[PDB]
Amino acid sequence: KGKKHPVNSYLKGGILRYSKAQMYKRRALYRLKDKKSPVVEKAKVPIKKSKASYPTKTFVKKRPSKANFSEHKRNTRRNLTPGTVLILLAGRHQGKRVVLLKVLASGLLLVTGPFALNSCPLRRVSQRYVIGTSSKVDLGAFKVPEHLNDAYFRRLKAKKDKKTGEADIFAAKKERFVPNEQRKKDQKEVDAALLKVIKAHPEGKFFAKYLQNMFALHSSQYPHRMRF
Amino acid sequence: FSKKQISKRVAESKRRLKKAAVIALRKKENLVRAEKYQNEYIKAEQREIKLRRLAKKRNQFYVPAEAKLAFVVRIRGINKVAPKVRKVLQLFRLRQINNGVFIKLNKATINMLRIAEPYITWGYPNLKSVRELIYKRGFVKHNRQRVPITDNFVIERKLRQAHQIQCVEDLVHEIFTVGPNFKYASNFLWPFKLNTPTGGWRKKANHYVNGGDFGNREDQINRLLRKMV
């Protein structure tokens, strides 16, 4: 049930693995199966299976040889630790601070205002959009976005129109807007637990009644010596 | 059976194994010979350090063995250059500004570097510097054409007849130590062509004494050269 290494990632060329494999080393027990099988069948009764020569037969359209798949190396985060209260410096929620809930497999952030205070939804935003401020909300109470995954907020649906299948349709479905009930319920539970932790800290720019206010680096104030 | 594919496909699996195995045996030769030279390099630093330690304790001044091996890099033109020096620069192979070759410190060479002085800044290159130059910047002269490296194997490529030299690092040993095949080894390298270092003093054409650059700045080149690569 195992045997591993390669601490090459620190070094960066090197060992542990070669050396230990040698200590362990067999000199005995080299016997193997591993069954291949095709299913290229002329199974003929009359059932007669084939396939023949479909075509890769020269309708010479020169089409660009597919550049295959770079590695899924796990997106090493900056010390944006969930729940750091951080600034969305960009895109409609421009200069509203929000609390981090999670890291997802897409690389990018889960952000909630809390919703009820600073009007920011269960909303996902780039690691780069964000200045990660020193202020920390206790992220232990949460249902966690184990339940909110890439797929969950993926849109149910931008059909090009009225569900079904080719009904010669009409201008305007709901590309951004109904809203969905499943998504409301998800917010309200998470936000409620946010509000309990967030109320412990005193009013001003950005935790509870602190949350509402819309950011001020006021005239004569400094984005560079703000050690956010 | 013989000339046709029946024997030619057999000369896939006979020789995919053979070629791969001898490449693998020569990989082990590469590793052993490389480790050996690094033992020699580390020891070489210790010998110098210990000679100094033992002397000073005995009151004695052991003044340490005068330096072999210089690296010469071109600050100057070609245009507005006197012909004596123009000729000397071609022979060095230093064709363009900031191209640099290694040149064996001999009584022969040092006089050419003197007439070449305002045109060149030179010093004693550390082993780090030689290693940084060959692996990134080091090209090969093969029938004119200036050819990669980076492979061990392409350095084995010629220099295995100059025994014990089957590696990229083994070429730099030969340069560094001024080994007997230095003529061919230095030749094999086509002049390394090196950006610019770092804030390289306005006065430029003054001897190193005057704050210049140009001169045998000795050991202070190691700072310069490492930055210029």
């Binding site: 010390n79 410096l89 200069g95 780069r128 400094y222 560079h224 | -």
Partner: protein, 157 residues
């Protein structure tokens, strides 16, 4: 003193929060025993936060080679090379006024009487905290002493 600098330099990293190391004080001041490890800087001016108040007041030039593909941008709050290094990376926009529309639906629908040219900040031009900037278009230079605008997206931690 090279050792002492090394010991002193462990301490601010400790405070940051974390990796959890060294403390070896540093002041943020009451401190029980520290006016030790120094009063900031500083070096200012402002905005900062949609937009550093920024000036396009130049192009990166030779004495008489105009070389406009990169621009000099003075970030107001950046006096110093350190401060302008905060802005290295940030996206920039110049929003400016037009008589005439042009652009219809893709994102919003902009009535394009307001035009925007989008750029990124690059490396630190100034001994005095001016910064280089590349823009996707490049800014016409009718923008000179015009206020250009630098959003703090992309900020690294």
């Amino acid at each position: 003193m090279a050792d002492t600098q090394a010991k002193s330099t462990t301490a601010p990293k400790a405070a940051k929060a974390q990796k959890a190391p060294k403390a070896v004080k540093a002041p943020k001041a009451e401190k029980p025993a520290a006016s030790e490890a120094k009063v900031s800087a500083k070096k200012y001016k402002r905005h900062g936060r949609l937009f550093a108040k920024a000036v396009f007041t130049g192009y990166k030039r030779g004495l008489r080679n105009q070389h406009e593909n990169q621009a000099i941008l003075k970030i107001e709050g950046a006096r110093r090379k350190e401060h302008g290094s905060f802005y290295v990376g940030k996206r920039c926009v110049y929003v400016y006024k037009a008589e005439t529309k042009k652009c219809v639906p893709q994102h919003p629908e902009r009535k394009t009487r307001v035009r925007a040219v989008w750029g990124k900040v690059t490396r630190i031009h100034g001994n005095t905290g001016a910064v280089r900037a590349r823009f996707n278009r490049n800014l016409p230079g009718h923008a000179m002493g015009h206020r250009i605008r630098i959003m703090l997206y992309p900020s690294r931690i």
